[PDB]
Amino acid sequence: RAELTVPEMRQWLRNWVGKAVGKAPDSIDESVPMVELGLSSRDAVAMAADIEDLTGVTLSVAVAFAHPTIESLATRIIE
Numbered sequence: 554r555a556e557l558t559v560p561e562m563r564q565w566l567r568n569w570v571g572k573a574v575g576k577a578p579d580s581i582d583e584s585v586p587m588v589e590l591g592l593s594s595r596d597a598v599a600m601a602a603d604i605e606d607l608t609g610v611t612l613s614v615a616v617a618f619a620h621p622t623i624e625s626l627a628t629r630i631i632e
């Protein structure tokens with residue numbers, strides 16, 4: 554119960570996207586492709602750095618685009 558969980562990772566991603574695009578985190582759709590959320594390439598760089606600070610994982614292009622939705626990405630980062 555101590556480790557970072559998938560619900561926690563999902564929430565953190567919704568918060569991040571919500572702040573980047575100016576929307577309530579609860580309104581961020583976890584099933585759409587993250588390239589359709591209104592994130593910029595600059596956002597991707599910043600989010601990748603923030604994920605590495607949160608989890609110690611350096612996210613590869615391969616992993617991210619093979620898990621291209623918030624819910625699938627969160628599941629793969631943790632799991």
Ligand SMILES: [Ca+2]
Pocket residue numbers: 573574575
């Ligand atoms: Ca923005």
Ligand SMILES: [Ca+2]
Pocket residue numbers: 574575576
């Ligand atoms: Ca707004």
Ligand SMILES: [Ca+2]
Pocket residue numbers: 583584
């Ligand atoms: Ca859904």
Ligand SMILES: [Ca+2]
Pocket residue numbers: 605606
């Ligand atoms: Ca660092």
Ligand SMILES: [Ca+2]
Pocket residue numbers: none
């Ligand atoms: Ca791994």
